[PDB]
Amino acid sequence: LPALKLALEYIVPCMNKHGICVVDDFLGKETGQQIGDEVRALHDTGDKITWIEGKEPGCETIGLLMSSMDDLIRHCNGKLGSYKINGRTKAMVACYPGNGTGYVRHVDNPNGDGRCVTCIYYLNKDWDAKVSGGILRIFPEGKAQFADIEPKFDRLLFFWSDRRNPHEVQPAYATRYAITVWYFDADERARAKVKYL
Numbered sequence: 001l002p003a004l005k006l007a008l009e010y011i012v013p014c015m016n017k018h019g020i021c022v023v024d025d026f027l028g029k030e031t032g033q034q035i036g037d038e039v040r041a042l043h044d045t046g047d048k049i050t051w052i053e054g055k056e057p058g059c060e061t062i063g064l065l066m067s068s069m070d071d072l073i074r075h076c077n078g079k080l081g082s083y084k085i086n087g088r089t090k091a092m093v094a095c096y097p098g099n100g101t102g103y104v105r106h107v108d109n110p111n112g113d114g115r116c117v118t119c120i121y122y123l124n125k126d127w128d129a130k131v132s133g134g135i136l137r138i139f140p141e142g143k144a145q146f147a148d149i150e151p152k153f154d155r156l157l158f159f160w161s162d163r164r165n166p167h168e169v170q171p172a173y174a175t176r177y178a179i180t181v182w183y184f185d186a187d188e189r190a191r192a193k194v195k196y197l
């Protein structure tokens with residue numbers, strides 16, 4: 001699907017209706033394999049998370065992914081709830097070493113630091129939840145039933161960052177790589193800037 005078709009006909013209505021969106025095969029085997037090579041390079045060369053602006057040497061494919069997310073979000077702007085997106089963080093590359101680690105139930109932005117949307121990219125090739133686990137569970141503002149998201153390769157996930165989506169990362173018994181970008185709300189972020197100082 002083209003960027004604006006994907007955005008308008010899927011991500012926008014889907015975030016409004018559920019607040020959680022998954023897009024599979026986002027960039028294809030070739031681009032995704034390259035992204036994975038770069039991430040595996042970052043970790044297998046040498047703080048289990050690192051921040052990438054996208055123009056660093058060797059992260060050019062990562063910057064490509066960040067740019068693609070940006071394109072989607074540009075097309076969603078003004079249609080994603082009442083938020084106006086005017087910026088985003090750098091990309092956080094995250095590693096779960098595979099020793100039974102995870103992340104306890106948490107909320108990304110519970111103190112109004114400006115982040116509304118969370119964007120995760122999964123680079124895990126031939127990943128079996130049964131054997132390796134590492135599933136992300138989102139409990140969408142209650143909603144009676146949670147959502148289990150496998151970190152399947154070339155998968156792009158969006159969800160609201162505020163209290164609406166509490167989520168946990170179930171223990172990982174294989175090495176788990178992902179890339180996360182957060183998108184800001186203009187007004188919330190401007191109020192946050194003043195409070196921090």
Ligand SMILES: COc1ccc2cc(-c3cnc(C(=O)NCC(=O)O)c(O)c3)ccc2c1
Nearest residue numbers: 049094103106108120136151167168169178
């Ligand atoms: C010390 O400075 C910081 C600043 C921000 C940080 C954010 C996270 C974080 C938050 N959420 C998730 C998550 O929900 N991941 C779901 C998934 O991977 O599928 C995650 O993996 C990692 C961890 C450490 C941080 C350290």
Ligand SMILES: [Mn+2]
Nearest residue numbers: 106107108167
């Ligand atoms: Mn999180």
